[PDB]
Short mmCIF file of C-alpha atoms in Angstrom, two decimals:
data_model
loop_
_atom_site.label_atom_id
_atom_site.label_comp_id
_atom_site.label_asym_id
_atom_site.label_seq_id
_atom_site.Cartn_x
_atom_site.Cartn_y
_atom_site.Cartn_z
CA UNK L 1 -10.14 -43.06 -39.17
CA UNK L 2 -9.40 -45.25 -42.43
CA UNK L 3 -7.95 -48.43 -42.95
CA UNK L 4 -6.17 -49.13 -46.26
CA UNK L 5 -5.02 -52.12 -47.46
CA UNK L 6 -2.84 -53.41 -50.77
CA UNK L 7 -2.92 -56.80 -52.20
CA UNK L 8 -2.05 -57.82 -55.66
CA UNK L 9 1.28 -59.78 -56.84
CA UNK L 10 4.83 -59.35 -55.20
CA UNK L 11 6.69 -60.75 -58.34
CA UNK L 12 6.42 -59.60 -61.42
CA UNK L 13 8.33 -60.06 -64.65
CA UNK L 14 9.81 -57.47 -66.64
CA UNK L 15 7.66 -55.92 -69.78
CA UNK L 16 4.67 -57.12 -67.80
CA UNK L 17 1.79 -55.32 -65.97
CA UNK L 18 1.97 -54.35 -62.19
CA UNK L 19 -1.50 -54.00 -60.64
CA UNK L 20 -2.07 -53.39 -57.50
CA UNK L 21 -5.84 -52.72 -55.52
CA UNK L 22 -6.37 -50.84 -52.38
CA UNK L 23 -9.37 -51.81 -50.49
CA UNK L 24 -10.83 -49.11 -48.07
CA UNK L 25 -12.95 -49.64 -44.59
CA UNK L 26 -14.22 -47.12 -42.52
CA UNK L 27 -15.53 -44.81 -45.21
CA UNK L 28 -16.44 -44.44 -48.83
CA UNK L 29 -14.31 -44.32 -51.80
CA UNK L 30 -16.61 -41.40 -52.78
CA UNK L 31 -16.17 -37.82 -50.90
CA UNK L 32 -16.09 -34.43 -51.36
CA UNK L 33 -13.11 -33.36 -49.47
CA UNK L 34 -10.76 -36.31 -49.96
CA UNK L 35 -9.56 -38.59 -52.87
CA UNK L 36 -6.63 -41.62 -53.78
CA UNK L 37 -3.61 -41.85 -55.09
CA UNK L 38 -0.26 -44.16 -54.68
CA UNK L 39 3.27 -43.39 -53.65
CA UNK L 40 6.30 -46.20 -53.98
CA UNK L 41 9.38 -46.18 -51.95
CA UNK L 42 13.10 -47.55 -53.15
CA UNK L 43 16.59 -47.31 -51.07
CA UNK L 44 17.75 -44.92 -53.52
CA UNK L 45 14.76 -42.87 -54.64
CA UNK L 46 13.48 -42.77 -51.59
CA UNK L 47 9.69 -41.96 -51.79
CA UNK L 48 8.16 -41.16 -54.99
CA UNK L 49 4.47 -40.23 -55.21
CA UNK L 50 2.67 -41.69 -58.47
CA UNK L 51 -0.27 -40.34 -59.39
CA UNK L 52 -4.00 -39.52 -57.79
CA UNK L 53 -7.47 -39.87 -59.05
CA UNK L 54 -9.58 -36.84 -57.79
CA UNK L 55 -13.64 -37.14 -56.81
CA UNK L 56 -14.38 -35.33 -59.94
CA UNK L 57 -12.61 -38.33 -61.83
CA UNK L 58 -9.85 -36.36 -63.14
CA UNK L 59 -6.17 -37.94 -63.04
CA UNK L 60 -3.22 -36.64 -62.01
CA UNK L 61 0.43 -38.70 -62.81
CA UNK L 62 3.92 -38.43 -62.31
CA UNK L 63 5.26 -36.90 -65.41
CA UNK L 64 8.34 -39.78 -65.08
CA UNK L 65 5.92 -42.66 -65.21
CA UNK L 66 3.04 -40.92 -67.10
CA UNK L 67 2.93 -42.81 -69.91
CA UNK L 68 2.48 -46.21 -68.01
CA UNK L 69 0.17 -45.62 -65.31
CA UNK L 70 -3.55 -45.72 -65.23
CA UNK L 71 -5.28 -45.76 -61.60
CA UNK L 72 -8.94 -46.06 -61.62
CA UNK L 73 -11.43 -46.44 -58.65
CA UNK L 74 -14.83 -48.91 -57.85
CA UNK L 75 -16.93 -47.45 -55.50
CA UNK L 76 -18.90 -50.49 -55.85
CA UNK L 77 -16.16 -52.81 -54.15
CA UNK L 78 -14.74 -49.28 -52.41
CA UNK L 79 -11.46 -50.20 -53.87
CA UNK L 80 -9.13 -48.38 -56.25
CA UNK L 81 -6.34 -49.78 -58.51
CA UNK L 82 -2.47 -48.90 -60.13
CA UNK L 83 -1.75 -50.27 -63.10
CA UNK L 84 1.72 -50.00 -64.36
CA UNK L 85 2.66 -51.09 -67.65
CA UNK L 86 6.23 -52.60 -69.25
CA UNK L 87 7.82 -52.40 -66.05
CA UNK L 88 11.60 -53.06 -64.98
CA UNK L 89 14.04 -53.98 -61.87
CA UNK L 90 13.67 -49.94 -61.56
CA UNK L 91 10.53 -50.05 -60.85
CA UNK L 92 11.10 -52.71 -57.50
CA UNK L 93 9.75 -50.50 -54.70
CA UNK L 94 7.24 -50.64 -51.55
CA UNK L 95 3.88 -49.10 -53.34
CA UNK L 96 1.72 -47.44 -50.58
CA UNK L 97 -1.68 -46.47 -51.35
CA UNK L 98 -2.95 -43.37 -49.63
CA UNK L 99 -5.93 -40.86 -49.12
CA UNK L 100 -5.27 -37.45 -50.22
CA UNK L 101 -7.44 -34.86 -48.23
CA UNK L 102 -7.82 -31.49 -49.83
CA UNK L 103 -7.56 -28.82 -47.21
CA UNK L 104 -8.95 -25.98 -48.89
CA UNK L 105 -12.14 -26.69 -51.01
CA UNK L 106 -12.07 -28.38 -54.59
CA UNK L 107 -8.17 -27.10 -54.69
CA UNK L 108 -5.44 -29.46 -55.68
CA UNK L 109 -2.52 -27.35 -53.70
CA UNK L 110 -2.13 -27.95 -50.17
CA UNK L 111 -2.79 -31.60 -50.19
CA UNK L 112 -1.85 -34.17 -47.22
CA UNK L 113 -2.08 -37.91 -47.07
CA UNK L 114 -4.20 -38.80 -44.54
CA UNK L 115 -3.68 -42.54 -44.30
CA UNK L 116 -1.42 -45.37 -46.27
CA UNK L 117 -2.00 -48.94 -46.67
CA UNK L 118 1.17 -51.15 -44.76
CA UNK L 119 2.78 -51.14 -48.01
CA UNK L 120 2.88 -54.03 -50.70
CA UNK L 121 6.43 -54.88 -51.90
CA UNK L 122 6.76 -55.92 -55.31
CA UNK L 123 10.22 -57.14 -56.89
CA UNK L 124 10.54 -56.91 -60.81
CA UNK L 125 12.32 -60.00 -61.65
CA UNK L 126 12.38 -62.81 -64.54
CA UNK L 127 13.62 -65.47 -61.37
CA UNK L 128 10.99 -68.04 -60.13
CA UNK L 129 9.52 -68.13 -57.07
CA UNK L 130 10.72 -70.33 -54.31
CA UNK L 131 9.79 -70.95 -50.75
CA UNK L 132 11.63 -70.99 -47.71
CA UNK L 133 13.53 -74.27 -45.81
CA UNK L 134 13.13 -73.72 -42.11
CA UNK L 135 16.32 -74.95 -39.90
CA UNK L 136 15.97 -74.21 -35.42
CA UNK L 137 18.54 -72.91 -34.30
CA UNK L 138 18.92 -74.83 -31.09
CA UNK L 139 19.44 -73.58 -27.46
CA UNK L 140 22.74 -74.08 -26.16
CA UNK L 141 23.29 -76.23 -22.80
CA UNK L 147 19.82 -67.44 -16.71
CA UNK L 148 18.80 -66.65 -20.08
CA UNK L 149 19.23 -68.37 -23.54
CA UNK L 150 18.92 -67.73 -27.18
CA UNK L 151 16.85 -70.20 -29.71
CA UNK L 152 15.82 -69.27 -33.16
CA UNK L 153 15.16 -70.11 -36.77
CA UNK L 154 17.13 -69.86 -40.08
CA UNK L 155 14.85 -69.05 -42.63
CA UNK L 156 16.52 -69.82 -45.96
CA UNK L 157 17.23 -69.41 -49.67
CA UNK L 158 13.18 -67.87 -50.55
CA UNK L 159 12.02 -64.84 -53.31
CA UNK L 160 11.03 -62.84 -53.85
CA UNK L 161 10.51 -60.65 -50.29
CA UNK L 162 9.31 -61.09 -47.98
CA UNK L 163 8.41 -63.77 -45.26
CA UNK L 164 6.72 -63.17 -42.07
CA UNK L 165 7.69 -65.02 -38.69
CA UNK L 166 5.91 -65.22 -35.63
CA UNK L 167 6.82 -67.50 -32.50
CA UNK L 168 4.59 -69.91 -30.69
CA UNK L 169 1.29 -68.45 -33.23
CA UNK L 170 2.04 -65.11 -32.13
CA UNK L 171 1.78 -65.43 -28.36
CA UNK L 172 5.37 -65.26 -27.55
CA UNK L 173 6.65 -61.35 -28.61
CA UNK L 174 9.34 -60.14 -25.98
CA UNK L 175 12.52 -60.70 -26.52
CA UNK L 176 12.40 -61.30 -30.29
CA UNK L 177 14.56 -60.33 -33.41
CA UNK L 178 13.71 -60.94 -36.41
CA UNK L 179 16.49 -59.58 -38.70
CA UNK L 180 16.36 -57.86 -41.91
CA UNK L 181 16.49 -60.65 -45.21
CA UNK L 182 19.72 -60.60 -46.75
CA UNK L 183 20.44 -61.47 -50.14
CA UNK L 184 22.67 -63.96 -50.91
CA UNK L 185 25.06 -64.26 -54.26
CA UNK L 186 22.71 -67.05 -55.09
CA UNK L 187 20.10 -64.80 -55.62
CA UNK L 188 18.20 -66.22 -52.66
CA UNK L 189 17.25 -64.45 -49.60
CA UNK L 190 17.65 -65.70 -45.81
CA UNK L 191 17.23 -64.20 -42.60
CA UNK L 192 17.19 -65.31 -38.68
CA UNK L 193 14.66 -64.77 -36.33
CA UNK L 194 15.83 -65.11 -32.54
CA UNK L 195 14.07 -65.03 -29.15
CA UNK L 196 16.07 -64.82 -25.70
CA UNK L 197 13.97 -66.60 -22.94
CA UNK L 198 14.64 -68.11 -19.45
CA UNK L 199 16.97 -70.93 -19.26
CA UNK L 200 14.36 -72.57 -16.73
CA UNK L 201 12.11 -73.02 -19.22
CA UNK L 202 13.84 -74.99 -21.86
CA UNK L 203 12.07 -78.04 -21.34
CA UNK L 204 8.71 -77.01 -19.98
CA UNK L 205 7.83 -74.56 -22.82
CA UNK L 206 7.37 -75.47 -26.13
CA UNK L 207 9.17 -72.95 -28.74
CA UNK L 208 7.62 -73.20 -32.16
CA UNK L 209 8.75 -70.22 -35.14
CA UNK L 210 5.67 -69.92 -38.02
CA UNK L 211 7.08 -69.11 -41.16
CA UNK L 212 4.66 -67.63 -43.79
CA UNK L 213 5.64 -66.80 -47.30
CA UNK L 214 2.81 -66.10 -49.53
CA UNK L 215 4.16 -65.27 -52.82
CA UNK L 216 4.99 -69.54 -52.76
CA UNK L 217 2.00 -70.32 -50.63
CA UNK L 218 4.83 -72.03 -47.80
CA UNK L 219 3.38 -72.16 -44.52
CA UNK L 220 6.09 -74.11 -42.14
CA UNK L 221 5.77 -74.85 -38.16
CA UNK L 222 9.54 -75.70 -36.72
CA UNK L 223 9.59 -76.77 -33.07
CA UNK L 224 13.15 -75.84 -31.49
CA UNK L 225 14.51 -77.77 -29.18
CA UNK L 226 17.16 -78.16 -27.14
CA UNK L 227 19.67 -80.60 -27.74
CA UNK C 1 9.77 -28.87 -60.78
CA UNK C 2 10.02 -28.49 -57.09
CA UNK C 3 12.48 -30.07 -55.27
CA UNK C 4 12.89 -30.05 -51.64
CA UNK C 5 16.04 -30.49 -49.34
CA UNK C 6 16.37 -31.59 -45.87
CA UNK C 7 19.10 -30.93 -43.29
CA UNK C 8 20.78 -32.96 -40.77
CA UNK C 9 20.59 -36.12 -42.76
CA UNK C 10 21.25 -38.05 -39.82
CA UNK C 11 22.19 -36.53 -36.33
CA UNK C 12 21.71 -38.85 -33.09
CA UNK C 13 20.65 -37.24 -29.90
CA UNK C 14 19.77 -38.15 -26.01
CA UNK C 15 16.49 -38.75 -24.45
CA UNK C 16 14.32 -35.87 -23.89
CA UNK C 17 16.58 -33.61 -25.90
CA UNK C 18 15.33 -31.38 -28.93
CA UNK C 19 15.20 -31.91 -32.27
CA UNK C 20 15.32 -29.51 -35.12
CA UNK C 21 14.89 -30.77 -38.78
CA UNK C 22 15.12 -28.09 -41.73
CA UNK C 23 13.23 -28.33 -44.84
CA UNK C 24 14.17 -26.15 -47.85
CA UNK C 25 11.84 -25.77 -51.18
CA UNK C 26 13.84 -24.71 -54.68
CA UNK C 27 10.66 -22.62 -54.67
CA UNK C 28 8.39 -21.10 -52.72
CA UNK C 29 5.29 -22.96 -51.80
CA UNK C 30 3.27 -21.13 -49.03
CA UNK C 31 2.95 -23.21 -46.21
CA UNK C 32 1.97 -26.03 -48.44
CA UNK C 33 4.41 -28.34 -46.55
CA UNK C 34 3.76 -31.52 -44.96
CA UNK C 35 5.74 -34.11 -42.27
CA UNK C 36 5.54 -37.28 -41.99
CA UNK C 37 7.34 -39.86 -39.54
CA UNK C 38 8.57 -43.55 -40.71
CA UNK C 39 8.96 -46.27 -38.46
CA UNK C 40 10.98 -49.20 -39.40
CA UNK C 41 8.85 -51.86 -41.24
CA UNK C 42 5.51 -49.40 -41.13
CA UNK C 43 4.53 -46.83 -43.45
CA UNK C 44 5.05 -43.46 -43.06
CA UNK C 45 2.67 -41.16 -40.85
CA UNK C 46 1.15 -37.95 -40.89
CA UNK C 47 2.73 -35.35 -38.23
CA UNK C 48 2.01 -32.15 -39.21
CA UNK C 49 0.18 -31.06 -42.19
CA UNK C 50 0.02 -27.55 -44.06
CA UNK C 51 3.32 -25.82 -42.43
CA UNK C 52 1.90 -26.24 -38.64
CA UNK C 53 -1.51 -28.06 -38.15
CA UNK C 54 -0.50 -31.01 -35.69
CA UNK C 55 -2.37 -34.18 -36.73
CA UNK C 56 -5.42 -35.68 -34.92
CA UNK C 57 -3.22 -38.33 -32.25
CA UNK C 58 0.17 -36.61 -32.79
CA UNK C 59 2.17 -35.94 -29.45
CA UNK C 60 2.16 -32.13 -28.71
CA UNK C 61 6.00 -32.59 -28.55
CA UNK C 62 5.98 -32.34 -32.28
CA UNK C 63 5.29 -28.77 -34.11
CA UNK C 64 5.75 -27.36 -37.49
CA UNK C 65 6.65 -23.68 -38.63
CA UNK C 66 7.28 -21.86 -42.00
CA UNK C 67 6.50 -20.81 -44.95
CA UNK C 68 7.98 -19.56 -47.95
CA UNK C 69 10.35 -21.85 -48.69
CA UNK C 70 12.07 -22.62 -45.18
CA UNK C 71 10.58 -24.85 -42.99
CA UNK C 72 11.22 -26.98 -39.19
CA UNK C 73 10.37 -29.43 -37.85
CA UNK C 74 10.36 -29.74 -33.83
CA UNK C 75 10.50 -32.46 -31.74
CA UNK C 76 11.09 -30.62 -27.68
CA UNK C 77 11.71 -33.80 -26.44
CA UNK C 78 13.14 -36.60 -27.89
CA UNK C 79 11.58 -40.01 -26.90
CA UNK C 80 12.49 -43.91 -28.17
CA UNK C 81 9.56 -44.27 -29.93
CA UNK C 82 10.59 -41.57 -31.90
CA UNK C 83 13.25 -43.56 -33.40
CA UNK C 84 12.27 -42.89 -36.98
CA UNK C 85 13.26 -41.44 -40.82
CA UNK C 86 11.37 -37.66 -41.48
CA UNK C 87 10.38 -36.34 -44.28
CA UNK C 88 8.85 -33.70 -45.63
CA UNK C 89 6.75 -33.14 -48.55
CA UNK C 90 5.88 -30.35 -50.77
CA UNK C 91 2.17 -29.97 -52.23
CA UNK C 92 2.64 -26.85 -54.01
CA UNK C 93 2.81 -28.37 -57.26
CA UNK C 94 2.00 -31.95 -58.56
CA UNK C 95 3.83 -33.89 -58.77
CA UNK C 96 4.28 -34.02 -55.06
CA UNK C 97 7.74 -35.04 -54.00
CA UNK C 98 9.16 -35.82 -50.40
CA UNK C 99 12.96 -34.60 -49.11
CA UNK C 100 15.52 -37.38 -49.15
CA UNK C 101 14.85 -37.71 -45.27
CA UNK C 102 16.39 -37.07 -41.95
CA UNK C 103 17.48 -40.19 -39.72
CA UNK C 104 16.86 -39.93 -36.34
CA UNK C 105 18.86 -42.03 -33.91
CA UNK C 106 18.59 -42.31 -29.80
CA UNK C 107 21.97 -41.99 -28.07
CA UNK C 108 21.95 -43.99 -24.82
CA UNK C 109 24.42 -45.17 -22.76
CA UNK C 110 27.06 -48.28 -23.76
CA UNK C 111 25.53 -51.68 -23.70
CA UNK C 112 27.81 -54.97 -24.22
CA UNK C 113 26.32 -57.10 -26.81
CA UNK C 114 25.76 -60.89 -25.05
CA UNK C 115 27.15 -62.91 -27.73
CA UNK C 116 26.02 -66.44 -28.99
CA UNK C 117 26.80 -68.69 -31.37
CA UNK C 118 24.86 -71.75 -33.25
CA UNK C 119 25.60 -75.08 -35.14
CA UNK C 120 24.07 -76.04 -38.79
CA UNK C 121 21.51 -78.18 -37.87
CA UNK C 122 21.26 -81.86 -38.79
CA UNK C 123 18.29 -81.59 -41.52
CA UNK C 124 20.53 -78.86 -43.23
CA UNK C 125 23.79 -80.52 -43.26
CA UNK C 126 21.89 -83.67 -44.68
CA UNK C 127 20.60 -81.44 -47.81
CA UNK C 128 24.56 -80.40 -48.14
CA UNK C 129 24.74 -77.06 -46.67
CA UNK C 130 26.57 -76.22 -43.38
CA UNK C 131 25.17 -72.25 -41.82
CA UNK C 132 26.99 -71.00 -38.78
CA UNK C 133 24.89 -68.01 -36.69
CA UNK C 134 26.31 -65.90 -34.42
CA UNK C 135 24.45 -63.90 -32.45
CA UNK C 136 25.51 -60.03 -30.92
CA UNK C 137 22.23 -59.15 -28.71
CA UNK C 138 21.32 -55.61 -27.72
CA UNK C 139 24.02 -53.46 -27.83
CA UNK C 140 24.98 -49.88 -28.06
CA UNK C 141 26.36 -48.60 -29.75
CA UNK C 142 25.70 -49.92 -33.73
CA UNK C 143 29.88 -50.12 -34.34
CA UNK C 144 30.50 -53.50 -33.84
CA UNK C 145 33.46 -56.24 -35.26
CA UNK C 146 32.68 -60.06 -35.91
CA UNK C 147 35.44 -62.45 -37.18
CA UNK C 148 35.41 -65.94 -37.92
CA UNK C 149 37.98 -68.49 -36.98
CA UNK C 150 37.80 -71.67 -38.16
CA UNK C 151 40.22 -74.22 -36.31
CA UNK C 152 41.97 -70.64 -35.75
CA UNK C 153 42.11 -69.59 -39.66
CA UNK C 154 40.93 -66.21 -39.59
CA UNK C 155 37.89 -66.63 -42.66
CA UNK C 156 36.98 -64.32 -45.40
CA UNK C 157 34.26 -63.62 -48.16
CA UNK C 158 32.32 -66.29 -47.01
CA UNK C 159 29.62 -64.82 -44.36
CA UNK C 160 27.32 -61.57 -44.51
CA UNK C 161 25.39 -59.85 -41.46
CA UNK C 162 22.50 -58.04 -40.40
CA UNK C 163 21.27 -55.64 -38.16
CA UNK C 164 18.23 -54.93 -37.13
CA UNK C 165 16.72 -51.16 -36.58
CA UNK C 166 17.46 -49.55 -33.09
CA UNK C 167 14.73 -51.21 -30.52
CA UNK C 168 11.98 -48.63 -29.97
CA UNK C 169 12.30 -49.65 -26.06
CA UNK C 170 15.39 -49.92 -24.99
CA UNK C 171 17.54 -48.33 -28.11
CA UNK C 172 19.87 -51.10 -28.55
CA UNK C 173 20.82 -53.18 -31.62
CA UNK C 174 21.03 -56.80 -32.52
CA UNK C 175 23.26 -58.00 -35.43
CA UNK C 176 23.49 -62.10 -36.60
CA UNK C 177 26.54 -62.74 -38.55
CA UNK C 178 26.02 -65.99 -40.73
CA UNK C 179 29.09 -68.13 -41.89
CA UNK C 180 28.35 -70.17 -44.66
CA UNK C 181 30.13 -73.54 -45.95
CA UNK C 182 29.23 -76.81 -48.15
CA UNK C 183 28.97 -79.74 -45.97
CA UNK C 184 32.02 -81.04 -47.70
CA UNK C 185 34.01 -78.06 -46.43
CA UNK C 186 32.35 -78.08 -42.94
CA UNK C 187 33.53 -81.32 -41.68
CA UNK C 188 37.02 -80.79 -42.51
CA UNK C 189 37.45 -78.72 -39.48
CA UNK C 190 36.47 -78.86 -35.79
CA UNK C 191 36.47 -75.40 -34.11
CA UNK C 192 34.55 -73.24 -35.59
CA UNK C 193 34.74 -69.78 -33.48
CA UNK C 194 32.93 -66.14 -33.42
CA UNK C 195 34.76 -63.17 -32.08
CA UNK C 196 33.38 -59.90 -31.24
CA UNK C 197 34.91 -56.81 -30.24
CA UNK C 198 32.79 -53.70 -29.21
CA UNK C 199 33.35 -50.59 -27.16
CA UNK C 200 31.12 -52.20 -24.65
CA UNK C 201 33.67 -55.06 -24.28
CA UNK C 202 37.66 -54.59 -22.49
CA UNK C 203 38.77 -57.33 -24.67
CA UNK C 204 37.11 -59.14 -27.23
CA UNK C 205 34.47 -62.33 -26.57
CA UNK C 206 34.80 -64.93 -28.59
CA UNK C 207 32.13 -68.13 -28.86
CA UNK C 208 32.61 -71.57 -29.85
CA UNK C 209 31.89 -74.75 -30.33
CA UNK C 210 33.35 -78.37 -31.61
CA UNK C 211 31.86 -79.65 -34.69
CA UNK C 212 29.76 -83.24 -33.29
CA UNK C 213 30.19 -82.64 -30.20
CA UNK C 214 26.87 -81.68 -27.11
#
């Protein structure tokens, strides 16, 4: 019914200011029945709801991060904001924004969340940004296995699609680990016909956008 | 305030089998009790809201009862898709707060991983790095055992693996284990070998390959 969608920064250093917007399409910031509000997600704290701005412009906050937050809405732009102020590596998480939709009228109990954005990961960290170096991993001489080794980036995350998103079965893209260096890597991998090493061209698009690194690797056999 | 506890944590289960996931609020909120459903990667989705109202789009396998402060979640018959986290969520009193989450995972039948294994590529050797891949593809089930061998000298500390999240297909796993080396290190040796073992397997598989050589 709604389509929400974060952007802001994925780094940011600690004692700074997080700030995050929320654009909406497919209705209006403004309502009767429904309002925003933000929830963050962590390994260990799992999910964590933040705070809410209601129609009547009254807002509600997390006791535990009170004193830091501010959210605030533009029905101009039909956006709304989080702000979160002198922030730490406890406050790395996945921040969601979401519609709250009342289900009895002008009552705050009862409340569901209706829709979330995909999620905007941001990493509290003093360490620089750095993109990614792109290495095939070559098909060996009825099916075969080619890939990429996407290397030593941050913050989270990177995105990789193969041959500009038309080629989808068949591929793994594994989970980023993190590496003592501080650096994160991960592998993406596609099985395909041995037949058609030579005929098809295999190219994995890596995208990270917190270091504006867009890299095209061809993988070939060797 | 209110905090809310959910039972199994994990439990795995066969196709087409029920579910049951139990909810319990330190105090009673009415029915004021919501689900939702996370995929891996995606946000998490709206099942049922207020105790039992099924969502707009949400299979009728799923359903919702209680009130007080025990409450279930049902799903009659499990499905891949449904390969997911659960949670519910209390919205009695602000602030709103979610259970820890129940893990849902698909028990299928036993599926050998097909193992490969790559070389460091040229350009990365060249900027002084050497990373060896090995590959375990779509298997079942998640226990599996990778060792490196290097010129038959079982290695140590220097490689870490991932897996991915079960396939919401065919409700397998992948896993890459990465061995790492400087380029000084790497061409000291020739065979550099990955060996799996998994209950899929009668004896372990191992993959290899001679440094410079095609």
């Amino acid at each position: 019914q709604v389509q929400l969608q974060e952007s802001g920064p994925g780094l940011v250093k600690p004692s700074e200011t997080l700030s995050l917007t929320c654009t909406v399409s497919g209705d209006s910031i403004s309502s009767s029945y429904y309002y925003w509000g933000w929830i963050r997600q962590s390994p260990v704290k799992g999910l964590e709801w933040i705070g809410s701005f209601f129609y009547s412009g009254n807002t509600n906050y997390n006791p535990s991060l009170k004193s830091r937050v501010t959210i605030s809405v533009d029905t101009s732009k039909n956006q709304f904001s989080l702000n979160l102020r002198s922030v730490t590596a406890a406050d790395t998480a996945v921040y969601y924004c979401a519609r709250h939709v009342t289900s009895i009228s002008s009552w705050n109990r009862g409340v569901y969340l209706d829709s979330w954005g995909r999620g905007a990961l941001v990493t509290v960290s003093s360490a620089s940004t750095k993109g990614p170096s792109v290495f095939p991993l070559a098909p060996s001489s009825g099916t075969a296995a080619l890939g990429c080794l996407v290397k030593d980036y941050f913050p989270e995350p990177v995105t990789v699609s193969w041959n500009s998103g038309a080629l989808t079965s068949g591929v793994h893209t594994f989970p980023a680990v993190l590496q003592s260096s501080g650096l994160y890597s991960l592998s993406s991998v596609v099985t395909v016909p041995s037949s058609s090493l030579g005929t098809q061209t295999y190219i994995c698009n890596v995208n990270h956008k917190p270091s504006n690194t867009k890299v095209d690797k061809r993988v070939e056999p060797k | 305030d209110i905090q809310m506890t959910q039972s199994p944590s994990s439990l795995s289960t066969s196709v087409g089998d029920r579910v049951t996931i139990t909810c319990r609020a330190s105090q009673t909120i009415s029915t004021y009790l919501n689900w939702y459903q996370q995929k891996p990667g995606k946000a998490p989705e709206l099942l049922i809201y207020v105790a039992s109202s099924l969502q707009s789009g949400v299979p009728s396998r799923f359903s919702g009862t209680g009130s007080g402060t025990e409450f279930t979640l049902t799903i009659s018959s499990l499905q891949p898709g449904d390969f997911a986290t659960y949670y519910c969520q209390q919205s009695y009193s602000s602030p709103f707060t979610f259970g820890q989450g129940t893990k849902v995972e698909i028990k299928r039948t036993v599926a050998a991983p097909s193992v490969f294994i790559f070389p460091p590529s040229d350009e990365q050797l060249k900027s002084g790095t050497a990373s060896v891949v090995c590959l375990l593809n779509n298997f079942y089930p998640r226990e599996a055992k990778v060792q490196w061998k290097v010129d038959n000298a079982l290695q140590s500390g220097n490689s870490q693996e991932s897996v991915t999240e079960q396939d919401s297909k065919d409700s397998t796993y992948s896993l890459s284990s990465t061995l790492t080396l400087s380029k000084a290190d790497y061409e000291k040796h020739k065979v550099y070998a990955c060996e799996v073992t998994h209950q899929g397997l009668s004896s372990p598989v191992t993959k290899s390959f001679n440094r410079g050589e095609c």
